[PDB]
Design a protein around this ligand. Structure first.
Ligand SMILES: *C(=O)[C@@H](N)Cc1ccccc1
Ligand SMILES: [Mg+2]
Lengths: 29, 143, 165, 29, 238
RNA sequence: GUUAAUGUAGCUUAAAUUAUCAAAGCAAGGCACUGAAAAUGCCUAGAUGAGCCUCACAGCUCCAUAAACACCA
RNA sequence: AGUAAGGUCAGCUAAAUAAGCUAUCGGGCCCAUACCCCGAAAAUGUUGGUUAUACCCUUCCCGUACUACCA
């Protein structure tokens, strides 16, 4: 059930475009 | 001398009688950067074939969302019943341990947990170095 | 009328709460922090911290809506002020730094009221199991220190406080 | 000289105490 | 005392390490949500530089009267290429580790998107039955502490696990077979306590013959129908 | 297998070829709407446990839920 | 008792644009001190209300002031 909240949207009316960026932590995660 | 301390005490009270201001949330306040900077998308064209499938898909999403709630509500129902029936059953057999199992025990909070990541942390990884500056625009006001 | 059997048929002030108006001089968040009941925990703050604004708020709404279905009183659903950190990476074959990126942190807090000791295991089980991706759940006690971060800084007092010491 | 009502009062079923537990109307319709 | 034997069982659970795969329905909607974001958004700074290239290129085509020929050095498309090359060259870990391929049901690096519940094999009456770790209750010791003591009794373990308050999470009553059944010990009552495994793992001394980690889907195979029913009640599917 | 309780949707109405216009009302969901709830707009999903008896009252039985005698490490 | 009426730097005054003089603190001039020249710091008796404050009103406190008469 870890995919029950990630499906969403930036609920706003005047927002700049956002792009999916895969950020890696200090480790390989 | 002694009077100056009186004013110092009084200046403490005068500032105390003022309201405790709260920092405005800049997330909910769009800066003037996006304030009509010619950055408007062209008139969006919606194909008729795309519109019919989009609305029809949302109907299934509403149905599928209800399915998740049904199993989740059923799952928490069973979990609540399983713990409740065991707690009451143990009370008759061992009344002394029932009181310990129900009294507020500060052995749970804080419960800091993180969420799963996209990929597991790899073995023997050496990230580069650097430094983290914190701008964190300050808001100091006086009265 | 008093003597009539239909007396008090219009009574309503005992149905709604008193709803004390926020007076101009008496405006204060008087919170009677409850601590250590027989089976009820104290006031708790569910701190949800994530890097993405949309993801952090989306899970915050789920927690707030879940409490309503479970008859858990929600005192407030405020938002902690955001913090911005400038990410600087080191340049290879050199020592001078360079501006890598600008990452921010967004925190959403869903303050909850007391809950039964039995329900503590069940309620927290649902929360941590549904952490979408990288959301840092933090369920800590509602002390005044944790609530001070919402307010501003007062250098005027710090000027006096330093000289007081 | 108070008198006894001839039947049940209109709003006597609900409990005056523990107002927060009782769900409100939340709507005018 | 009582004929029943008080036992404290520990239901150690490993939280998932990676995000579970999206269902086919969720994939379609995820594309739709991202599509709506672009439609209702403004032009970002990078998108502004896309028109900045168009502004300069248009001058290079028709309005060849630009005052300054220095301008910038890099381009918006070139900037994306710089990050793309680093990203393609860079490599990450594998969601499905070697444990899944080899079906090593003991290591903690299996089913990173699932939940693993600790199971151990105990020999009672010359019979090996897979069961959750457990210990006998003792005087002057709460039932929760009995499960806490069970963690310390594991063979060469350094695991740190957060428990859940003091209230239990389930129960299971069984009676001994009539061959060894007596009024002194009619049976036993097993109480389960849930804990979250933070860090740590067993040593390399004994792995296959000591403990295994399985999910709820295959949990019934190692158990028996009488004992299985009570376990699945408090085990939240995830 | 056997002994004792119950089975219209989440609760509940009418109904239950007893007659009648009819399976209702409220909950519970998706989307939009300053940021949370809540309102509001648009919008999604549906059961008369099963058979028999009575055919012009409605209940028994079956099965199932579920407890028990009782298989268990 | 009643009424009248005031509190501001350490001190005394004028304005509420919190200023001026002096005192106090630091430095210069002189053999040293003072004078003198230069620089800095300093307060609205008290509580509450006055859009918000201050000159206002109110509460508290100190002290000041007049009157207390016909038989
Ligand atoms: C299980 O079937 C029994 N053999 C368990 C047992 C009971 C008493 C003594 C030893 C073993
Ligand atoms: Mg809303």
């Amino acid at each position: 059930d870890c995919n029950r909240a990630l499906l969403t949207r930036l609920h706003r009316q005047t927002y700049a475009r956002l792009y999916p960026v895969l950020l890696v932590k200090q480790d390989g995660s | 001398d002694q009077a100056a301390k009186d004013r110092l005490k009084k200046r403490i009270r005068r500032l105390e009688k003022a309201s405790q201001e709260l920092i405005p949330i800049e997330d909910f306040i769009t800066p003037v950067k996006f304030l009509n900077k010619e950055r408007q998308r062209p008139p969006v064209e919606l194909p008729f074939e795309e519109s019919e499938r989009r609305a029809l898909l949302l109907k299934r999403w509403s149905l599928y969302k209800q399915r998740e709630h049904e199993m989740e509500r059923s799952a928490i129902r069973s979990l609540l019943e399983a713990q409740e029936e065991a707690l009451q059953e143990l009370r008759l057999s061992s009344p002394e341990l029932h009181a310990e199992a129900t009294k507020r025990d500060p052995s749970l909070f804080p419960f800091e947990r993180q969420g799963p990541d996209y990929t597991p942390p790899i073995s023997d990884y050496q990230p580069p170095e650097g430094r983290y500056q914190d701008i964190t625009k300050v808001y100091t006001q006086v009265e | 009328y008093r003597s009539k059997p239909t007396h008090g048929i219009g009574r309503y002030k005992h149905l709604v709460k008193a709803q004390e108006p926020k007076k101009k001089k008496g405006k204060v968040e008087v919170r009677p922090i409850n601590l250590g009941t027989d089976y009820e925990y104290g006031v708790l703050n569910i701190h949800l911290i994530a890097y993405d604004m949309a993801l952090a708020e989306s899970y915050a709404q789920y927690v707030h809506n879940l409490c309503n279905h479970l008859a858990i009183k929600v005192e407030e659903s405020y938002a902690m002020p955001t913090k911005t950190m400038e990410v600087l990476q080191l340049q290879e074959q050199g020592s001078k730094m360079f501006l890598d990126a600008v990452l921010t942190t967004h925190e959403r807090v869903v303050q909850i009221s007391g809950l039964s000791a039995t329900f503590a295991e069940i309620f927290l089980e649902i929360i941590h199991s549904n952490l979408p991706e990288g959301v840092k759940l933090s369920v800590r006690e509602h002390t005044e220190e944790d609530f001070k971060g919402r307010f501003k800084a007062r250098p005027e007092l710090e000027e006096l406080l330093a000289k007081l010491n | 000289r108070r008198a006894a009502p001839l039947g049940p009062m209109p709003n006597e079923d609900i409990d005056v105490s523990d107002l927060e537990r009782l769900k409100k109307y939340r709507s005018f319709d | 005392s009582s004929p029943w034997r008080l036992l404290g069982a520990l239901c150690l659970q490993r939280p998932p390490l990676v995000t579970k795969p999206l269902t086919p329905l969720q994939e379609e909607m995820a594309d739709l949500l991202q599509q709506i974001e672009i439609e209702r958004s403004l032009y970002s700074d990078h998108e502004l530089r896309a028109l900045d290239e168009a502004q300069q290129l248009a001058k290079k085509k028709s309005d060849l009267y630009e005052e300054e020929d220095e301008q910038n050095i890099l381009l918006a498309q070139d900037l994306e290429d710089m990050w793309e090359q680093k990203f393609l060259h860079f490599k990450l870990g594998a969601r499905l580790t070697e444990a899944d391929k080899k079906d090593d049901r003991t290591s903690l690096h299996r089913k990173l998107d699932r939940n693993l519940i600790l199971l151990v094999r105990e020999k009672l009456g010359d019979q090996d039955i897979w069961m959750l770790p457990q210990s006998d209750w003792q005087p002057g010791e709460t039932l929760r502490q009995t499960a806490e003591r069970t963690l310390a009794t594991l063979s060469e373990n350094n695991m740190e696990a957060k428990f859940l308050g003091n209230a239990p999470c389930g129960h299971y009553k069984f009676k001994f077979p009539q061959a060894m059944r007596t009024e002194t010990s009619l049976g036993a009552k097993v109480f389960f306590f849930k804990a979250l495994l933070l860090t740590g793992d067993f040593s390399q001394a004994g792995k296959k013959g000591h403990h295994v980690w399985v999910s709820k889907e295959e949990l019934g195979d190692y158990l028996k129908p009488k004992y299985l029913a009570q376990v699945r009640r408090f085990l939240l599917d995830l």
